A paper describes a structure:
COR belongs to the large and well-studied AKR superfamily, which is characterized by the TIM-barrel fold and mechanistically flexible NAD(P)H dependant oxidoreductase activity. The overall three-dimensional structure of COR reveals a TIM-barrel fold common to the AKR superfamily, in which eight parallel β-strands form a central barrel surrounded by eight α-helices to form the (α/β)8 barrel. The residues that form the canonical catalytic tetrad are contributed by the β2α2 loop (Asp-51 and Tyr-56), β3 (Lys-86) and loop A (His-119).
Although 1 mM NADPH and 1 mM codeine were present during crystallization, no electron density corresponding to NADPH was seen. Although weak electron density was seen in the active site at a location expected for codeine, this electron density was too weak to define a precise mode of binding. The most notable structural feature of COR is the shifting of the β1α1 loop away from the cofactor binding tunnel, which is made particularly evident when compared with structures of CHR and 3α-HSD. The asymmetric unit of this crystal structure of apo-COR reveals three homodimers with C2 rotational symmetry. The lack of conservation of the Cys-220 residue and the reported localization of COR in a reducing environment in the plant suggest that the intermolecular disulfide bond may be the result of purifying and crystallizing COR in an aerobic environment, even though reducing agent was present during purification, and protein samples were stored at –80 °C prior to crystallization.
Author numbering: 5 to 127, 133 to 319
The structure:
């Protein structure tokens, strides 16, 4: 099945997880049925965020998955949620996590991440984007683990530069850095630093977010990946996701239909040859998921090069 990844703290992590559609609107009951279907197919790692108001759909799906005997216990699952920038302030982190736990109908999370390396004024508007205090927020994240409300803590979309900034006063180092990674964004430099510090790389937007406004077609319409997919008898989607795992990375994928989420679990039964990786290593680079919704002429980051340090 899905291999387990041993994180730096000893916590086991299912290498392949399923995320939630990045819609900052309410949750549909078709989302809940998709989560329940993933559990029935064989997914145990699920990745949500408080910014998408879809946690209650995952909480309902977990509850019904236990009712239907699909899983026998909650400790069979690896639930992850993220801290929204509006609550990315010291005294506001623990109320934020306890709210996500009440929405999820859970008592603890398996992993708690910081969504973006920025803060927001508690109330996209560009006047509200505020520079993050990495030391005080991470200390609150560190307390969230000590009190038992989460088993591990991490970060999302953190550059190698900003990681060292958070690693300075860190008592509990980040276990996971969830960043964009695909055959069009190799992240060699970031994966080089995280490997030497035992930070796990979890890849989002493995397919370039073809369905989102901030996405592109650089992965799904790649004629390089098409050629490999036919040689190996796979789809373009499985070639990209196999590449991420074969680089020693975790990955969260968004599955809107039972056809794809059944095929996604088959990336662990085959292997890309040595050339296949060399032909992919020379693919031109293009970052899809842009933080231009977080770029403010008044805030900490005003260009794409400052947010990503590239």
């Amino acid at each position: 099945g899905v291999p387990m990844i041993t994180l730096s703290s000893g916590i086991r992590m299912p290498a392949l997880g399923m995320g939630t559609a990045e819609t900052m609107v309410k949750g549909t009951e078709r989302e809940k049925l998709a989560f329940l279907k993933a559990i029935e197919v064989g997914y145990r790692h699920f990745d949500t965020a408080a910014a998408y108001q879809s946690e209650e759909c995952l909480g309902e799906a977990i509850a019904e998955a236990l009712q239907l005997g699909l899983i026998k216990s909650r400790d069979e699952l690896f639930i992850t949620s993220k801290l929204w920038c509006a609550d990315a302030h010291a005294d506001l982190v623990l109320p934020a996590l306890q709210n996500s736990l009440r929405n999820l109908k859970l008592d603890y999370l398996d992993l708690y991440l910081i969504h973006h390396p920025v803060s927001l004024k508690p109330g996209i508007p560009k006047d509200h984007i505020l520079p993050m205090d990495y030391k005080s927020v991470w200390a609150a994240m560190e307390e969230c683990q000590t009190l038992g409300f989460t088993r591990a803590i991490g970060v999302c979309n953190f550059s190698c530069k900003k990681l060292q900034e958070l690693m300075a006063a860190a008592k509990i180092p980040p276990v996971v850095n969830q960043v964009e990674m695909s055959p069009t964004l190799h992240q060699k430099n970031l994966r080089e630093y995280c490997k030497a510090n035992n930070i796990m790389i979890t890849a989002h937007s493995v397919l370039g977010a073809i369905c989102a406004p901030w996405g592109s077609n650089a992965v799904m319409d790649s004629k390089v990946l098409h050629q490999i997919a036919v040689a190996r008898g796979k789809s373009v989607a499985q070639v990209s996701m196999r590449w991420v795992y074969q680089q020693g990375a975790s990955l969260v994928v968004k599955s809107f239909n039972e056809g794809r989420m059944k095929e996604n679990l088959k990336i662990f039964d085959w292997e890309l040859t040595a050339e296949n990786m060399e032909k992919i290593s020379e693919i031109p680079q293009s970052r899809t998921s842009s933080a231009d919704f977080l770029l403010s002429p008044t805030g900490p980051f005003k260009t794409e090069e400052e947010f990503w340090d590239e």
